[PDB]
Write a protein that binds this ligand. Sequence first.
Ligand code: ZN
Ligand code: ZN
Ligand code: ZN
Ligand code: ZN
Ligand code: ZN
Ligand code: ZN
Lengths: 379, 369, 317
Amino acid sequence: QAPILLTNVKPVGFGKGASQSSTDILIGGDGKIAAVGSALQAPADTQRIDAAFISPGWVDLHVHIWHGGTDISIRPSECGAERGVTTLVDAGSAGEANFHGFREYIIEPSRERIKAFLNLGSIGLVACNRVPELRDIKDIDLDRILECYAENSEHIVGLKVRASHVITGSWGVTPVKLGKKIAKILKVPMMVHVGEPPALYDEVLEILGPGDVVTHCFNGKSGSSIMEDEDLFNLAERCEGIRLDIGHGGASFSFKVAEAAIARGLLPFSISTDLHGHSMNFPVWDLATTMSKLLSVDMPFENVVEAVTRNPASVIRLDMENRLDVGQRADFTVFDLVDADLEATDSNGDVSRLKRLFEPRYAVIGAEAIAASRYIPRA
Amino acid sequence: PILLTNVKPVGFSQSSTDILIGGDGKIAAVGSALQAPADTQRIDAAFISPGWVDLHVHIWHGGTDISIRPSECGAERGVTTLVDAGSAGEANFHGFREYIIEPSRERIKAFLNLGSIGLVACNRVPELRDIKDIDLDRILECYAENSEHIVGLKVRASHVITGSWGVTPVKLGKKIAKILKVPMMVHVGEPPALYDEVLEILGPGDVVTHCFNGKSGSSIMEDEDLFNLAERCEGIRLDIGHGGASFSFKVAEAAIARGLLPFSISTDLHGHSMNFPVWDLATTMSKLLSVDMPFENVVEAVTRNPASVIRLDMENRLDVGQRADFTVFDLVDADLEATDSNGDVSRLKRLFEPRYAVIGAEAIAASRY
Amino acid sequence: LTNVKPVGFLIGDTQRIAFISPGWVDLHVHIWHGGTDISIRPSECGAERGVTTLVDAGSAGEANFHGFREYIIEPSRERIKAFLNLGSIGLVACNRVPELRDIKDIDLDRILECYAENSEHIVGLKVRASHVITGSWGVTPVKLGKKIAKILKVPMMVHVGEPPALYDEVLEILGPGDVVTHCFNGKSGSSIMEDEDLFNLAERCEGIRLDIGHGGASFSFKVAEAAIARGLLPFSISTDLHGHSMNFPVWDLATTMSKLLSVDMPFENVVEAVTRNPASVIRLDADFTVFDLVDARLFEPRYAVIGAEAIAASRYI
Ligand SMILES: [Zn+2]
Ligand SMILES: [Zn+2]
Ligand SMILES: [Zn+2]
Ligand SMILES: [Zn+2]
Ligand SMILES: [Zn+2]
Ligand SMILES: [Zn+2]
């Protein structure tokens, strides 16, 4: 593997003490940072220049990449490196039933770092929303979940529960409490999706605790929106440990909800694209576009980059310190923030025209440097 | 180029001959004592026939929990055509096709499951709970674009799966199979969905697996009215689904004595059935030979019969130009203990012994599990 | 009346100046306005559309037929009859809240009671045998429906649809006088042109009446052609006119009549399957409907005459 020299990059999203000024980075054939400085010299190696931003590889904490195994999932190549995303976290596409399938077909052969939230339900998302995975307790197998996690602690970062009547139907919070019980036993975080009331947003925040994650935090749907209920809003703002995740995905993101939230100081902990076969082409295009929508409703730049690197990484226990150090395995994402006039639409059909766009250029994993680019809607 | 020498053809008549297979994997010549030039030669002593077919197996290795890899019940076991029995429903059929069908050496066919989630979590999370598990539309769509892979619909009709639902699912399954103009393989088990009723819905071409089980409520020997209906059922194929609960020497020996033999001999192979009850298709063949089903008859139940169900052409296989596809096996004398899905043990005095599986220009060494 | 051409067979003024037949009858409509979410007003289909005989297809069950009776039947001009739904709640929340979910939905004693009390209103029992309504129990509510209707001496209108409750299986239960609605639907699993066996059973079923339940998804031109152009033609032309079908696919009874004329059904049979035939189902025999097939060919309601009362009929827009 030949070494690489990335020249003219502007380090962002690293330590609080990382120089923001332009630099050059040298990657060794072993995919490790050989040097970092104002103008290094190199042997016979791929030299790439830009003009700008470089940060640790983007982490999309919420995707569905159980391609083939489930019906709703996409491929990691469709939302990964070619997009500037280095770490992908499948969000409960697989349960204990076919996780070994996910590991062998999706995790092991992928060039990106792939972690997964194990679904509380056994059948995961094979027939997503058509044949609910948490229809009752026969769908939950605690012993097999414990068995599954023990054999895949290197891959499974927590449990997922979709607390919404479309999935859980009529028994609401029970599965969430059960979820919390097993998560506590496994000593792992819990990511909970909120939607159509029956298994109320308010109830979930109550049972959750430090490190837990609520995805779809800023959905603008009746019965789940934090802006229609001041009591809910006050609780979300109070819930002090609980991670709020955008998980934008066709029905879970509203510009209006997010605007109001950010104006009141409530920022999302992490920005994610609940990307799958039905949200990729239209609503959500890619993480970059999602980062652009948050930036458009006043989330300071530095915080959006952080809600896509350091923050989601903490949830999955991904070490992201001293990443620029020599010897550290190169794991970056080169992107620009350019002026534009693009219209993107949220999960509420509301259209907004972004004036600035995160635009990934290269995703460099070790010695490999992949040409990245925003998703172009083939429709 | 491969030159199989000293093989005794069956299932195709002729006698001890030789087969030369060119590089393109097609038969170049078949005759006694052929002469070849600097190319591999495989000799023996040793029957040969079209590549064995397992009409009932469970692959879809990672998409489901019970399934096994096709390399554990395929070529190395002397089997060239595997037919997954409903491991996938419309929900995740692709994927089965991308991960299992496409990369395999053997011809891999599949019965699509009437129930969308198929056997992801086999038996634990029933696939045919209610009507919400059958998406008529998606089944037609899926088939329309996988017709070269899907050979039929599958509807496991027993309470462990269908709970308190009657033959209703079986009736629906039948209506759809007609629309798709394909056969339906039905599984019979715990009485809550009567064997006697399945046969009545089914038609010619359709298959019934677990046809010789020894479980109360679904056995053909305990009910003289059922047994009679089984033999009357003239177009309906009976397939042994020897798995972990669907075969009984007792029943077979009884049904074969009365001149009712199985149409096909399949091994309902999966995680929980490979290791103990059934081992490989070979052993199951020896099992049926053991209860008086004639040798030529056994070989046919593993080649022409199953193939006729999956519409796999098997005519003139030894001709020049035909793709090489055979199972080189022996029939040795032995005395090893084996048992059915009812614990009932038996002593096999003769055993089929896969030697090689020849698929095109590739000859893989084979053996019993 | 003058310049009227009688087909299919001056009261107390004036009479206008071209066809004329007995007031048309829609055997399948939903006019339980107000009482159900899906029903339309009795005057959005009917007199002003050239239909003097409306028949509600199970909008009401025993639980609120009385409400249908005084709010719709009595104050209305047209002759309103109705099939009582085997299911208590009826179509109060159509499809959203199924009427035949379980046996707890049928009340044999109240169905009997209800008929006894409205035998001059109710013309039969209806059953929506499809998985959208009956979920996983297919024929059970149909066999049960027949049983009740039988011991009720009235006809039964059975709607077929999504496969679960098999079209095939329904035809086997029915008897002469019974009516199958949505007969020429071109939807998967329920179409009579995707299973030679069904069409055979369809034709072979010489008693059982086939009705065109042209609703939001039950009438197909292709299916219509193939059948009607091979012998089996509809015993009666109907328009499953509800709050979601009137405004788009099946505008008015006339349009549907014209659709079943644009295929292969002769004028003689179309006009008969809108008067005599359907009338024989609700047991019917001062009352007129004048129309004039034009060019574009389609029917055009002109006038409705209900005893010294002529209304300016005119198709939907
Ligand atoms: Zn979700
Ligand atoms: Zn999701
Ligand atoms: Zn089985
Ligand atoms: Zn099986
Ligand atoms: Zn209807
Ligand atoms: Zn209707």
